[PDB]
Paper text:
The key enzyme in the microbial production of PDC is 4-carboxy-2-hydroxymuconate-6-semialdehyde (CHMS) dehydrogenase, which acts on the substrate CHMS. CHMS dehydrogenase, on the other hand, has only been characterized functionally from Sphingomonas SYK-6 (10) and Pseudomonas ochracea. These studies have demonstrated that the enzyme is a NADP+/NAD+-dependent oxidoreductase with a cofactor preference for NADP+. By sequence analysis using Interpro, PmdC is classified under the Rossmann fold-NAD(P)+ binding oxidoreductase superfamily, sharing common structural characteristics with the Gfo/Idh/MocA oxidoreductase protein family.
The crystal structure of PmdC bound to NADP was solved to a resolution of 2.34 Å, spanning 98.75% of the protein sequence, Lys 3–Asn 317. Each asymmetric unit contained six copies of PmdC, existing as three dimers. The crystal structure revealed dimerization occurs at the interface between the C-terminal ß-sheets of each monomer. Each monomer has two domains: An N-terminal cofactor-binding domain bound to NADP (residues 1–141) and a C-terminal substrate binding and oligomerization domain (residues 145–317). NADP is bound to PmdC within a tube-like cavity formed at the interface between the N-and C-terminal domains. Residues within this sequence participate in stabilization of the diphosphate backbone of NADP. This includes hydrogen bond and electrostatic interactions between the main-chain peptide backbone of Ala12, Gly13, and Ala14 with the diphosphate group of NADP. Structural data revealed density within this region that was best fit with a sulfate ion from within the crystallization solution. The His177A mutant exhibited a 98% loss of activity while the H178A and H181A mutants showed an 89% and 83% loss of activity respectively compared to WT PmdC.
Author numbering:
A (entry chain A), B (entry chain B): 3 to 317
Write the structure that this text describes.
C-alpha cells in the first residue's frame, strides 16, 4: 500500500525532502502545509500535490493521510508533533525534536502512549560518510579517541542555508550542537558523561548567542570538541574530524576523506548518496515493517538531556 | 657591543634559533650546550661555536657570556632559567616557562629580584600573520568574537616536529595549550575569566594524555575553542581561525588567509618572515635598550595561572 504523507513547511529543507521522496516507490505527498497559501500552492503545483493548507490541523483532519513530515521552524516542532500523534499519524520531525527538554519529554511520552512511529531527523546518522565510519566501528576495526567539529554560518540575519530570509530565529544550541552531541555518543558507542559549554554575548536584534563552544566526554573516555558560530565569513556548514586508533577521517556532508585528503568512496554504503532520502527511507520502512526507526525519539532523547544540562550551565 | 650568547639544547629548535641568529648583527653564540659531547661538538663546528659543553654550568661560568637561550627539554626549563639569573645572565626560555606553577613563580620572583631580562618563547606573538591580526586590533578595525584552534601531531612515540626521536616526553597542556592560552588573551585584549578542559585516557607507555579539549572565555565575552592531539594522523602543527566582527582569518605559521582561503601578504609587517628570528631580535633589542621584552615572564605569567587552573580541573 502507498503511504500517504502530509509535508509541513515548504522551505529549503521541505523542498529537499520532496525531491528525495520523488525517488521512493510507494509514498505520495497528498497535502502541503505552509504559512502562505499562494506560495504553498506554487510548490504543490510544481510537485503535483493535491491538498494545500495554512493550518496543520487541516491535513490532520484528512483520514487518508498516514504520516507527517515536519520541516517547520523549530519553535513549532514539539506542539505539532504532539498534534500529529493525537490525530493517530506517524511523525518525522526535523532536528531539533524541541527547544525545551519538557516538550521533548512530552513528545516522547505521547509516542510511548500511542506506540506510533515518531522519528527525529538526525540526518548525520544517515549520511553515507558517517555510516561508513560507524560500520568500521561496529566491525571493531576503529575506535574514536577525539571528534573535532566546526558548525559555521555567516548569519547575522534570520536566513536559511540558501541565503534566503527566515520569518523565525534559529539557535546554536538546540539545532546545530544537537547534531554533534547525538552523533558523538552514537559513533563512540558510549554515553556522554561530561559536558561544558561557554557562549559569547547575546545579539541585540536576534536575541540569541552568535558564538558557542561545547566539550564532551564519553564514559569510555572519548572526547569531542565543538565550535559553533553565526559570525563565520567562510564556507558554511559542518566539518567533522574523527581521530581514532587506526586512522583519521574528515567528513564533509556525504563526502569522506582520510586525514591526508584522500577521498574515500562511500557510494557503495547505501542505496542513495542523499542522506535526506535515506532518512525518509528509514522512516517509511519503519512504518511498513512496524518497527522502530533508527533515530527514533527514544533513541535520540539523551541528546536533548545533555543539551538541557548545557543550557542550565549557560544560564 | 656584540652580545655574547650561550645556547642550550642543539635539538630541532636550537638549530632553528642558530639559523635565525646568523641574521642578527651584533650577536654571537660563543657556547653550545648538549647532552652528548660529540653531537654538540659537530653542531658547534657547523656553526663556528668555539666552546662546547655538556652542562649548562660550564657555559654560565664563562665571564664573557651575556645571555642564554634555553631550548632544552621542558622539564629543565624552570631550574635552568633560575640558574641563568643567579649567574647574572639574561635568559630566554622556550615555551613553556615551566610545567608547574610553583617553578614559574620561582622564575618570576628571581627575575624581579635581579631586574634581568627574562623572556619566554611565545613565538605566536612574533609570527607576522599574528602580528598583522594584532595590529588590526590595535587600530580598532577588528574585534575577536571566537578563536577556533587545532594543535595536532601524530606522536605515539617521544618525537620532535621533524620526526626524530626525543630522549624526553612531551605534554599537551603545559607545552602546547600554552601557545593558545597566551595568544587568546593577548589577541583578545582581555583577560581570560573562564576555562574548562576534558582529556582522554593516559597512555600506558608514555604516561601522558593523548587528547585534550580546552574552552576559554575572555572578560569581554570573546570565546576560544582548542582541540589538542598526539593521535592525529594528518598534517602536524597548529591551525588558527580568528572569527571577528569585520572578518575571518586563518593563521598557518607565518602565513595568513581570509575565511575564503585568499592568502594575505604579511611581508610588510616586520623586518623578517621568520618568527623565531623576530623573537630573538626582540630579546636582543630589550637587552640592548634596557627595557622589558614583548613576551616577558611578567606579560605571560597569567597564562601559566590559567594552565594551573585547568590541570586542577582535569584532576
Ligand atoms: N540537517 C538537517 O536535517 C536540517 C537542515 C536544515 C533545517 N533543519 C530544520 O528544518 C526546519 C526548517 O528549516 P528551513 O531552513 O527549511 O526553514 P525555512 O526555509 O526558513 O522555512 C521552513 C518553512 O516553514 C514555513 N512556515 C512558517 N510558518 C509556518 C506555519 N505556521 N505553518 C506551516 N509552515 C510554516 C516557512 O514559510 P515562510 O518562511 O514563507 O513563512 C518556510 O517556508 C528547522 O527547524 C530546522 O532546524 C534540519
Ligand atoms: N613554538 C616554539 O617556539 C617551540 C616549538 C617546539 C618546541 N619548543 C620547545 O623547545 C624545547 C626543545 O624542543 P625540541 O623539539 O627542539 O626538542 P628536541 O629536539 O627533543 O631536543 C632539544 C635538545 O636538547 C638536548 N638535551 C637533552 N638533555 C640535555 C642536557 N642535559 N643539556 C643540554 N641539552 C640537552 C637534546 O639532546 P638529546 O636528544 O641527545 O637528549 C636535544 O638535542 C622544548 O621544551 C619544546 O617544548 C618550542
Amino acid at each position: 500500500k502507498t503511504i500517504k504523507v502530509a509535508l509541513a513547511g515548504a522551505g529549503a529543507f521541505g523542498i529537499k525532502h520532496l525531491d528525495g521522496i520523488k525517488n521512493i516507490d510507494g509514498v505520495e505527498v497528498v497535502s502541503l502545509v505552509g504559512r502562505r497559501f499562494d506560495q504553498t500552492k506554487e510548490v504543490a503545483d510544481k510537485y503535483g500535490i493535491a491538498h494545500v493548507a495554512t493550518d496543520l490541523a487541516e491535513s490532520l483532519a484528512l483520514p487518508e493521510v498516514d504520516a507527517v513530515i515536519l520541516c517547520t521552524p523549530t519553535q513549532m516542532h514539539a506542539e505539532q508533533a504532539i498534534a500529529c500523534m493525537k490525530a493517530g499519524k506517524h511523525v518525522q520531525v526535523e532536528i531539533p525534536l524541541a527547544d525545551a527538554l519538557k516538550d521533548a519529554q512530552e513528545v516522547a511520552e505521547l509516542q510511548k502512549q500511542t506506540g506510533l512511529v515518531a522519528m527525529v531527523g538526525h540526518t548525520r546518522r544517515f549520511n553515507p560518510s558517517h555510516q561508513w565510519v560507524h560500520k568500521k566501528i561496529e566491525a571493531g576495526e576503529f575506535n574514536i579517541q577525539q571528534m573535532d567539529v566546526q558548525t559555521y554560518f555567516f548569519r547575522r540575519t534570520n536566513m536559511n542555508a540558501l541565503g534566503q530570509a527566515r520569518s523565525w530565529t534559529d539557535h546554536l544550541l538546540w539545532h546545530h550542537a544537537a547534531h554533534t552531541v547525538d552523533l558523538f555518543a552514537y559513533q563512540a558507542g558510549s554515553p556522554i558523561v561530561k559536558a561544558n559549554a561557554v557562549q559569547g554575548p547575546i545579539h541585540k536584534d536576534l536575541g540569541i548567542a552568535m558564538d558557542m563552544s561545547i566539550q564532551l566526554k564519553a564514559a569510555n573516555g572519548a572526547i569531542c570538541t565543538l565550535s559553533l558560530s553565526f559570525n563565520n565569513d567562510g564556507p558554511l556548514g559542518t566539518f567533522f574530524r574523527y581521530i581514532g586508533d587506526t586512522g583519521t577521517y574528515l567528513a564533509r556532508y556525504d563526502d569522506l576523506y582520510t586525514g591526508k585528503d584522500e577521498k574515500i568512496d562511500v557510494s557503495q554504503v547505501d542505496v542513495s548518496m542523499n542522506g535526506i532520502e535515506l532518512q525518509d527511507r528509514e522512516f517509511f520502512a519503519a512504518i511498513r515493517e512496524g518497527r522502530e526507526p533508527n533515530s527514533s525519539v527514544q533513541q535520540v532523547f539523551n541528546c536533548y538531556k545533555v543539551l538541557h544540562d548545557l543550557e542550565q550551565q549557560l544560564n
